[PDB]
Amino acid sequence: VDVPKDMTKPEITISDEPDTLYKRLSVLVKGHDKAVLDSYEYFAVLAAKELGISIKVHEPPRKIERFTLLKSVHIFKKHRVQYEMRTLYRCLELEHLTGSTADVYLEYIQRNLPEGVAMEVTKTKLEQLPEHIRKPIW
Amino acid sequence: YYVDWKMLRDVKRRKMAYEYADERLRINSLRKNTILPKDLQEVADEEIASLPRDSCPVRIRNRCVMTSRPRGVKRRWRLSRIVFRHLADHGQLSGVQRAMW
Amino acid sequence: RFYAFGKLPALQTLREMKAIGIEPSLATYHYVIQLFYQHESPSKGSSLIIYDIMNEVMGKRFSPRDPDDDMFFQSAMRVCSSLRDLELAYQVHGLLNTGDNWKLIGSDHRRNFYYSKFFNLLCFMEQIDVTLKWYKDLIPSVFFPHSQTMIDLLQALDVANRLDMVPQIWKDS
Amino acid sequence: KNRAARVRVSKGDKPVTYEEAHAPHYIAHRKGWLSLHTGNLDGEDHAAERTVEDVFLRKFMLGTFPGCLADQLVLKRRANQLEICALVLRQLPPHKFYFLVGYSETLLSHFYKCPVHLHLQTVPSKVVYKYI
Amino acid sequence: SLWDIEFAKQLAAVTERPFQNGFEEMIQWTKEGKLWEFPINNEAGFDDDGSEFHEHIFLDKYLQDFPKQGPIRHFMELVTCGLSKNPYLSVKQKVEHIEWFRNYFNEKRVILKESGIQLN
Ligand SMILES: [Mg+2]
Ligand SMILES: [Mg+2]
């Protein structure tokens, strides 16, 4: 029943500057357990479909790092214990994005990063040409 | 308290070695160079062998950080093999697990 | 603090600042409602003046930036409890929730006064459909029932003949 | 016989938590990780720091809430903040619990220079998975 | 003005509620500086003295005082080139290296003259 009235106050400004264009934006999520990466993938895709961001998602091969230690405190070298660390990946590949849209989508996505996962963001941005190269010659 | 006197020694060593890093580097520049004359290099030689002996890095040991064990250490966690296993086997090391394959 | 009829010079002051461009603080309006209340008890016209001053005050979004402001939203709602007028309480609430609700009430005691009185109005003045509704929203969630809000639920179910909600209100109480 | 992190079979009366009833070879199979952080992943850094931090947190918490700690701690690290989550026996009056919540969160926040959250879940008696 | 500060404090006191949500906690924390800024940029907090890449790459300016044709140019152009590739150091620090060399060579004139090359 009880509804707070007039609850919204967003603050946005438009600078005259030519906002940066991103040809492609790759987001690589590393994690330990698969399921979390699947849930995250679902969430990310859903979040992009709602912003009309047009993304693809593929899965890069998993890396398993193994190593050995001695099983005993003192001396039996013949006996060992082997440990693993498995790193699993998702790749979210977004295309034809703008600067603002990128900053929002990335803000939202990054906030919601689960605790056992990491993320790498490769932005390939579009720039026309530098000034001194345009068509001068020395 | 560092767990052992040895560990104490090591802490000191890392401090000194941090302090004189700049001097040592600057001098070993001269020392390692073919371009400069030998007469500069012999003086520079006595120069770097003048420096306090506990300032040189080869005298450092990576020790287990909790238990002070001098070897059987895994560099990544700075942990003795024994303490490492003890943490991992209670599952307090994230993403570490026994290995079957 | 001196004359209860010293609201007429003060009222003049209330117009005076409005000439020079400075938007009247919630502290100003509070003191206004204080003397206007002291003169509201015997005479119910000054009440209508508080209610209309408030009526102009409430179409607006606040910036509670001055020192004394708490007792405004204290006494703005306080009058509706004595005079038993619910519409202007809906208005005080629409005012509260607007600019920053949280920043508009200073203390917890002065906070529970608000709900004691407001729910006092809601219970008897409104249909059971509305009272039962705002009940579950306000009582466990925000601020907890005193004796005054306790007796009100009791008198609200005697008049509307509701025997169904007795076990619930008892277990909550 | 492997002994590591095991709770041996007694005469059959021994109460055992879900955690304690599972030997290390069950990690990532049945029981999960008592900590979560980015450090042990393939390309990542400062694993060592987070390990030491972890050890100190278990010790600290165990001493700050004497006798009321039910099971081992859960440490979630997310984007520079650590949420500690604990199972607590009801021993203390809620006064002592809130006092220690606030005291801790502030203390550790100033120690490790990051925001620290503390989440208490309260339990009548040690949850029992097995024997008993 | 202490009175303006106690006024801003008395105002901020009526203004400040205990948090009504998580989002509030995060908002106050962010403004405070406790929380991180998003989307994350790792360079946040550190601008490196507002220096620009030419005060990094090109160290010629500090080789102005040094013998121009000698083996000292060889050595010092190597040191220079090294510092040119060094990310972990500030401009200030590189210059301090350069100057330590200035001072150390100008410390020993004697050994240099005797060495078989007259060196400035
Ligand atoms: Mg000892
Ligand atoms: Mg060695």
Side-chain angles (χ1 to χ4, degrees), chain C residues 99-122:
Chain C
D100 326 276
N101 25 13
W102 316 298
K103 309 185 178 183
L104 296 191
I105 304 172
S107 41
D108 297 335
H109 197 63
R110 300 187 184 185
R111 189 114 191 252
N112 72 65
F113 270 103
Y114 187 98
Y115 301 94
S116 182
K117 305 170 189 163
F118 193 92
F119 203 77
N120 195 329
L121 303 186
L122 282 177

PDB file of all heavy atoms in Angstrom, chain C residues 99-122:
ATOM      1  N   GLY C  99      11.405  14.906  -1.281  1.00  0.00           N
ATOM      2  CA  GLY C  99      12.747  15.431  -1.484  1.00  0.00           C
ATOM      3  C   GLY C  99      13.852  14.521  -0.985  1.00  0.00           C
ATOM      4  O   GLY C  99      14.627  13.995  -1.786  1.00  0.00           O
ATOM      5  N   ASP C 100      13.932  14.330   0.330  1.00  0.00           N
ATOM      6  CA  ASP C 100      14.573  13.163   0.916  1.00  0.00           C
ATOM      7  C   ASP C 100      13.771  12.819   2.150  1.00  0.00           C
ATOM      8  O   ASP C 100      13.826  13.562   3.117  1.00  0.00           O
ATOM      9  CB  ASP C 100      16.036  13.434   1.280  1.00  0.00           C
ATOM     10  CG  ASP C 100      16.711  14.394   0.321  1.00  0.00           C
ATOM     11  OD1 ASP C 100      17.189  13.946  -0.747  1.00  0.00           O
ATOM     12  OD2 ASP C 100      16.757  15.602   0.637  1.00  0.00           O
ATOM     13  N   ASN C 101      13.106  11.672   2.174  1.00  0.00           N
ATOM     14  CA  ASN C 101      12.299  11.322   3.346  1.00  0.00           C
ATOM     15  C   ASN C 101      13.167  11.180   4.590  1.00  0.00           C
ATOM     16  O   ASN C 101      12.893  11.761   5.647  1.00  0.00           O
ATOM     17  CB  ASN C 101      11.505  10.031   3.103  1.00  0.00           C
ATOM     18  CG  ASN C 101      12.151   9.130   2.068  1.00  0.00           C
ATOM     19  OD1 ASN C 101      13.307   9.326   1.692  1.00  0.00           O
ATOM     20  ND2 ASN C 101      11.407   8.133   1.605  1.00  0.00           N
ATOM     21  N   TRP C 102      14.242  10.424   4.424  1.00  0.00           N
ATOM     22  CA  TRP C 102      15.181  10.114   5.487  1.00  0.00           C
ATOM     23  C   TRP C 102      15.757  11.361   6.159  1.00  0.00           C
ATOM     24  O   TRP C 102      15.822  11.443   7.378  1.00  0.00           O
ATOM     25  CB  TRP C 102      16.291   9.240   4.910  1.00  0.00           C
ATOM     26  CG  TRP C 102      15.727   8.156   4.025  1.00  0.00           C
ATOM     27  CD1 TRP C 102      14.878   7.155   4.399  1.00  0.00           C
ATOM     28  CD2 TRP C 102      15.975   7.968   2.620  1.00  0.00           C
ATOM     29  NE1 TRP C 102      14.587   6.351   3.315  1.00  0.00           N
ATOM     30  CE2 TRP C 102      15.248   6.827   2.214  1.00  0.00           C
ATOM     31  CE3 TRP C 102      16.744   8.650   1.671  1.00  0.00           C
ATOM     32  CZ2 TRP C 102      15.267   6.356   0.896  1.00  0.00           C
ATOM     33  CZ3 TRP C 102      16.761   8.180   0.364  1.00  0.00           C
ATOM     34  CH2 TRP C 102      16.027   7.045  -0.010  1.00  0.00           C
ATOM     35  N   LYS C 103      16.127  12.357   5.369  1.00  0.00           N
ATOM     36  CA  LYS C 103      16.724  13.564   5.924  1.00  0.00           C
ATOM     37  C   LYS C 103      15.705  14.482   6.626  1.00  0.00           C
ATOM     38  O   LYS C 103      16.100  15.478   7.256  1.00  0.00           O
ATOM     39  CB  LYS C 103      17.453  14.341   4.819  1.00  0.00           C
ATOM     40  CG  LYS C 103      18.439  13.514   3.995  1.00  0.00           C
ATOM     41  CD  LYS C 103      19.215  14.371   2.981  1.00  0.00           C
ATOM     42  CE  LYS C 103      20.234  13.519   2.211  1.00  0.00           C
ATOM     43  NZ  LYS C 103      21.042  14.347   1.264  1.00  0.00           N
ATOM     44  N   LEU C 104      14.415  14.159   6.531  1.00  0.00           N
ATOM     45  CA  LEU C 104      13.400  15.082   7.029  1.00  0.00           C
ATOM     46  C   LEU C 104      12.948  14.856   8.485  1.00  0.00           C
ATOM     47  O   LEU C 104      12.088  15.576   8.976  1.00  0.00           O
ATOM     48  CB  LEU C 104      12.180  15.045   6.106  1.00  0.00           C
ATOM     49  CG  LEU C 104      12.363  15.527   4.657  1.00  0.00           C
ATOM     50  CD1 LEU C 104      11.034  15.693   3.898  1.00  0.00           C
ATOM     51  CD2 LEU C 104      13.224  16.784   4.554  1.00  0.00           C
ATOM     52  N   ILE C 105      13.500  13.861   9.172  1.00  0.00           N
ATOM     53  CA  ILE C 105      13.164  13.647  10.585  1.00  0.00           C
ATOM     54  C   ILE C 105      14.446  13.359  11.378  1.00  0.00           C
ATOM     55  O   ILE C 105      15.186  12.423  11.069  1.00  0.00           O
ATOM     56  CB  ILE C 105      12.132  12.499  10.783  1.00  0.00           C
ATOM     57  CG1 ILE C 105      10.854  12.767   9.972  1.00  0.00           C
ATOM     58  CG2 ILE C 105      11.814  12.339  12.265  1.00  0.00           C
ATOM     59  CD1 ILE C 105       9.882  11.609   9.946  1.00  0.00           C
ATOM     60  N   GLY C 106      14.713  14.193  12.379  1.00  0.00           N
ATOM     61  CA  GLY C 106      15.970  14.166  13.111  1.00  0.00           C
ATOM     62  C   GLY C 106      16.161  13.039  14.114  1.00  0.00           C
ATOM     63  O   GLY C 106      17.211  12.398  14.140  1.00  0.00           O
ATOM     64  N   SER C 107      15.164  12.810  14.963  1.00  0.00           N
ATOM     65  CA  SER C 107      15.322  11.863  16.070  1.00  0.00           C
ATOM     66  C   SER C 107      14.270  10.747  16.078  1.00  0.00           C
ATOM     67  O   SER C 107      13.209  10.877  15.466  1.00  0.00           O
ATOM     68  CB  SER C 107      15.299  12.610  17.409  1.00  0.00           C
ATOM     69  OG  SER C 107      14.312  13.625  17.408  1.00  0.00           O
ATOM     70  N   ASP C 108      14.580   9.664  16.794  1.00  0.00           N
ATOM     71  CA  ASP C 108      13.743   8.460  16.835  1.00  0.00           C
ATOM     72  C   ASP C 108      12.471   8.639  17.663  1.00  0.00           C
ATOM     73  O   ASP C 108      11.427   8.076  17.336  1.00  0.00           O
ATOM     74  CB  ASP C 108      14.543   7.279  17.393  1.00  0.00           C
ATOM     75  CG  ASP C 108      15.717   6.904  16.516  1.00  0.00           C
ATOM     76  OD1 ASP C 108      15.666   7.182  15.298  1.00  0.00           O
ATOM     77  OD2 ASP C 108      16.689   6.323  17.046  1.00  0.00           O
ATOM     78  N   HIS C 109      12.563   9.415  18.739  1.00  0.00           N
ATOM     79  CA  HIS C 109      11.392   9.733  19.551  1.00  0.00           C
ATOM     80  C   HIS C 109      10.423  10.593  18.733  1.00  0.00           C
ATOM     81  O   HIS C 109       9.232  10.265  18.567  1.00  0.00           O
ATOM     82  CB  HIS C 109      11.812  10.447  20.837  1.00  0.00           C
ATOM     83  CG  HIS C 109      10.757  10.447  21.897  1.00  0.00           C
ATOM     84  ND1 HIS C 109      10.289   9.291  22.484  1.00  0.00           N
ATOM     85  CD2 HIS C 109      10.077  11.464  22.479  1.00  0.00           C
ATOM     86  CE1 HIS C 109       9.367   9.595  23.379  1.00  0.00           C
ATOM     87  NE2 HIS C 109       9.219  10.908  23.396  1.00  0.00           N
ATOM     88  N   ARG C 110      10.967  11.682  18.192  1.00  0.00           N
ATOM     89  CA  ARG C 110      10.228  12.584  17.314  1.00  0.00           C
ATOM     90  C   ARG C 110       9.816  11.875  16.024  1.00  0.00           C
ATOM     91  O   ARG C 110       8.939  12.349  15.303  1.00  0.00           O
ATOM     92  CB  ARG C 110      11.060  13.832  17.001  1.00  0.00           C
ATOM     93  CG  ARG C 110      11.425  14.634  18.242  1.00  0.00           C
ATOM     94  CD  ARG C 110      12.090  15.949  17.882  1.00  0.00           C
ATOM     95  NE  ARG C 110      12.515  16.675  19.075  1.00  0.00           N
ATOM     96  CZ  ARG C 110      13.032  17.899  19.062  1.00  0.00           C
ATOM     97  NH1 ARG C 110      13.188  18.544  17.913  1.00  0.00           N
ATOM     98  NH2 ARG C 110      13.390  18.478  20.202  1.00  0.00           N
ATOM     99  N   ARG C 111      10.442  10.734  15.744  1.00  0.00           N
ATOM    100  CA  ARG C 111      10.021   9.891  14.632  1.00  0.00           C
ATOM    101  C   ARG C 111       8.795   9.041  15.007  1.00  0.00           C
ATOM    102  O   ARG C 111       7.856   8.938  14.218  1.00  0.00           O
ATOM    103  CB  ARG C 111      11.164   8.983  14.169  1.00  0.00           C
ATOM    104  CG  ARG C 111      10.865   8.232  12.883  1.00  0.00           C
ATOM    105  CD  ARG C 111      11.765   8.683  11.742  1.00  0.00           C
ATOM    106  NE  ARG C 111      11.319   8.155  10.451  1.00  0.00           N
ATOM    107  CZ  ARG C 111      11.943   7.203   9.762  1.00  0.00           C
ATOM    108  NH1 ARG C 111      13.051   6.655  10.238  1.00  0.00           N
ATOM    109  NH2 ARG C 111      11.459   6.800   8.592  1.00  0.00           N
ATOM    110  N   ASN C 112       8.781   8.455  16.208  1.00  0.00           N
ATOM    111  CA  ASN C 112       7.657   7.592  16.582  1.00  0.00           C
ATOM    112  C   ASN C 112       6.399   8.405  16.895  1.00  0.00           C
ATOM    113  O   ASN C 112       5.286   7.885  16.787  1.00  0.00           O
ATOM    114  CB  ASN C 112       8.012   6.657  17.761  1.00  0.00           C
ATOM    115  CG  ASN C 112       8.130   7.376  19.101  1.00  0.00           C
ATOM    116  OD1 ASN C 112       7.153   7.918  19.622  1.00  0.00           O
ATOM    117  ND2 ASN C 112       9.313   7.310  19.700  1.00  0.00           N
ATOM    118  N   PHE C 113       6.572   9.670  17.284  1.00  0.00           N
ATOM    119  CA  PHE C 113       5.423  10.588  17.373  1.00  0.00           C
ATOM    120  C   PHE C 113       4.658  10.612  16.055  1.00  0.00           C
ATOM    121  O   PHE C 113       3.422  10.487  16.030  1.00  0.00           O
ATOM    122  CB  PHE C 113       5.861  12.019  17.721  1.00  0.00           C
ATOM    123  CG  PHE C 113       5.900  12.306  19.197  1.00  0.00           C
ATOM    124  CD1 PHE C 113       7.106  12.353  19.884  1.00  0.00           C
ATOM    125  CD2 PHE C 113       4.728  12.530  19.897  1.00  0.00           C
ATOM    126  CE1 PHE C 113       7.138  12.618  21.245  1.00  0.00           C
ATOM    127  CE2 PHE C 113       4.750  12.794  21.253  1.00  0.00           C
ATOM    128  CZ  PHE C 113       5.955  12.838  21.931  1.00  0.00           C
ATOM    129  N   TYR C 114       5.418  10.754  14.970  1.00  0.00           N
ATOM    130  CA  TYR C 114       4.883  10.844  13.617  1.00  0.00           C
ATOM    131  C   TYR C 114       3.943   9.684  13.304  1.00  0.00           C
ATOM    132  O   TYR C 114       2.813   9.895  12.879  1.00  0.00           O
ATOM    133  CB  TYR C 114       6.032  10.905  12.595  1.00  0.00           C
ATOM    134  CG  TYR C 114       5.613  11.156  11.154  1.00  0.00           C
ATOM    135  CD1 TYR C 114       5.661  12.435  10.605  1.00  0.00           C
ATOM    136  CD2 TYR C 114       5.192  10.111  10.333  1.00  0.00           C
ATOM    137  CE1 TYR C 114       5.287  12.669   9.281  1.00  0.00           C
ATOM    138  CE2 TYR C 114       4.815  10.336   9.012  1.00  0.00           C
ATOM    139  CZ  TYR C 114       4.863  11.614   8.493  1.00  0.00           C
ATOM    140  OH  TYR C 114       4.490  11.822   7.183  1.00  0.00           O
ATOM    141  N   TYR C 115       4.405   8.463  13.538  1.00  0.00           N
ATOM    142  CA  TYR C 115       3.624   7.279  13.188  1.00  0.00           C
ATOM    143  C   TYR C 115       2.513   6.986  14.201  1.00  0.00           C
ATOM    144  O   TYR C 115       1.452   6.475  13.827  1.00  0.00           O
ATOM    145  CB  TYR C 115       4.549   6.062  13.035  1.00  0.00           C
ATOM    146  CG  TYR C 115       5.603   6.256  11.965  1.00  0.00           C
ATOM    147  CD1 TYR C 115       6.861   6.726  12.293  1.00  0.00           C
ATOM    148  CD2 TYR C 115       5.334   5.984  10.627  1.00  0.00           C
ATOM    149  CE1 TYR C 115       7.834   6.915  11.325  1.00  0.00           C
ATOM    150  CE2 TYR C 115       6.298   6.174   9.649  1.00  0.00           C
ATOM    151  CZ  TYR C 115       7.547   6.641  10.003  1.00  0.00           C
ATOM    152  OH  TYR C 115       8.512   6.831   9.038  1.00  0.00           O
ATOM    153  N   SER C 116       2.757   7.300  15.473  1.00  0.00           N
ATOM    154  CA  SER C 116       1.721   7.218  16.498  1.00  0.00           C
ATOM    155  C   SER C 116       0.496   8.002  16.052  1.00  0.00           C
ATOM    156  O   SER C 116      -0.614   7.465  15.970  1.00  0.00           O
ATOM    157  CB  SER C 116       2.237   7.757  17.834  1.00  0.00           C
ATOM    158  OG  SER C 116       1.256   7.632  18.845  1.00  0.00           O
ATOM    159  N   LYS C 117       0.726   9.268  15.719  1.00  0.00           N
ATOM    160  CA  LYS C 117      -0.357  10.169  15.345  1.00  0.00           C
ATOM    161  C   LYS C 117      -0.943   9.860  13.968  1.00  0.00           C
ATOM    162  O   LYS C 117      -2.170   9.852  13.784  1.00  0.00           O
ATOM    163  CB  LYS C 117       0.141  11.610  15.383  1.00  0.00           C
ATOM    164  CG  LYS C 117       0.745  12.012  16.710  1.00  0.00           C
ATOM    165  CD  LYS C 117       1.436  13.348  16.601  1.00  0.00           C
ATOM    166  CE  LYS C 117       2.218  13.667  17.856  1.00  0.00           C
ATOM    167  NZ  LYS C 117       3.228  14.747  17.645  1.00  0.00           N
ATOM    168  N   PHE C 118      -0.068   9.597  13.004  1.00  0.00           N
ATOM    169  CA  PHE C 118      -0.503   9.355  11.638  1.00  0.00           C
ATOM    170  C   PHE C 118      -1.333   8.083  11.520  1.00  0.00           C
ATOM    171  O   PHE C 118      -2.364   8.048  10.824  1.00  0.00           O
ATOM    172  CB  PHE C 118       0.700   9.267  10.716  1.00  0.00           C
ATOM    173  CG  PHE C 118       0.346   9.317   9.278  1.00  0.00           C
ATOM    174  CD1 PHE C 118       0.328  10.525   8.610  1.00  0.00           C
ATOM    175  CD2 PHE C 118       0.003   8.163   8.593  1.00  0.00           C
ATOM    176  CE1 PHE C 118      -0.007  10.580   7.281  1.00  0.00           C
ATOM    177  CE2 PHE C 118      -0.338   8.210   7.264  1.00  0.00           C
ATOM    178  CZ  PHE C 118      -0.346   9.421   6.604  1.00  0.00           C
ATOM    179  N   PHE C 119      -0.880   7.030  12.190  1.00  0.00           N
ATOM    180  CA  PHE C 119      -1.625   5.785  12.155  1.00  0.00           C
ATOM    181  C   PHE C 119      -2.848   5.878  13.062  1.00  0.00           C
ATOM    182  O   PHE C 119      -3.845   5.169  12.846  1.00  0.00           O
ATOM    183  CB  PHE C 119      -0.762   4.601  12.557  1.00  0.00           C
ATOM    184  CG  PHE C 119      -1.279   3.303  12.033  1.00  0.00           C
ATOM    185  CD1 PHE C 119      -1.085   2.952  10.705  1.00  0.00           C
ATOM    186  CD2 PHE C 119      -2.008   2.459  12.845  1.00  0.00           C
ATOM    187  CE1 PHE C 119      -1.582   1.769  10.208  1.00  0.00           C
ATOM    188  CE2 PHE C 119      -2.508   1.277  12.355  1.00  0.00           C
ATOM    189  CZ  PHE C 119      -2.297   0.929  11.036  1.00  0.00           C
ATOM    190  N   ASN C 120      -2.779   6.759  14.064  1.00  0.00           N
ATOM    191  CA  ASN C 120      -3.966   7.094  14.846  1.00  0.00           C
ATOM    192  C   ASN C 120      -5.068   7.623  13.929  1.00  0.00           C
ATOM    193  O   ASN C 120      -6.219   7.228  14.059  1.00  0.00           O
ATOM    194  CB  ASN C 120      -3.636   8.121  15.933  1.00  0.00           C
ATOM    195  CG  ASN C 120      -4.724   8.235  16.986  1.00  0.00           C
ATOM    196  OD1 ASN C 120      -5.906   8.033  16.707  1.00  0.00           O
ATOM    197  ND2 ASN C 120      -4.322   8.543  18.216  1.00  0.00           N
ATOM    198  N   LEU C 121      -4.710   8.509  12.998  1.00  0.00           N
ATOM    199  CA  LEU C 121      -5.683   9.004  12.013  1.00  0.00           C
ATOM    200  C   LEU C 121      -6.156   7.908  11.057  1.00  0.00           C
ATOM    201  O   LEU C 121      -7.366   7.736  10.825  1.00  0.00           O
ATOM    202  CB  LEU C 121      -5.097  10.151  11.186  1.00  0.00           C
ATOM    203  CG  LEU C 121      -4.586  11.381  11.921  1.00  0.00           C
ATOM    204  CD1 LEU C 121      -4.178  12.442  10.916  1.00  0.00           C
ATOM    205  CD2 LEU C 121      -5.666  11.881  12.860  1.00  0.00           C
ATOM    206  N   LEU C 122      -5.188   7.182  10.494  1.00  0.00           N
ATOM    207  CA  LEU C 122      -5.479   6.146   9.501  1.00  0.00           C
ATOM    208  C   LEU C 122      -6.466   5.103  10.020  1.00  0.00           C
ATOM    209  O   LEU C 122      -7.326   4.653   9.281  1.00  0.00           O
ATOM    210  CB  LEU C 122      -4.194   5.444   9.048  1.00  0.00           C
ATOM    211  CG  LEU C 122      -3.262   6.109   8.035  1.00  0.00           C
ATOM    212  CD1 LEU C 122      -2.034   5.245   7.815  1.00  0.00           C
ATOM    213  CD2 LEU C 122      -4.001   6.314   6.725  1.00  0.00           C
TER     214      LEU C 122
END
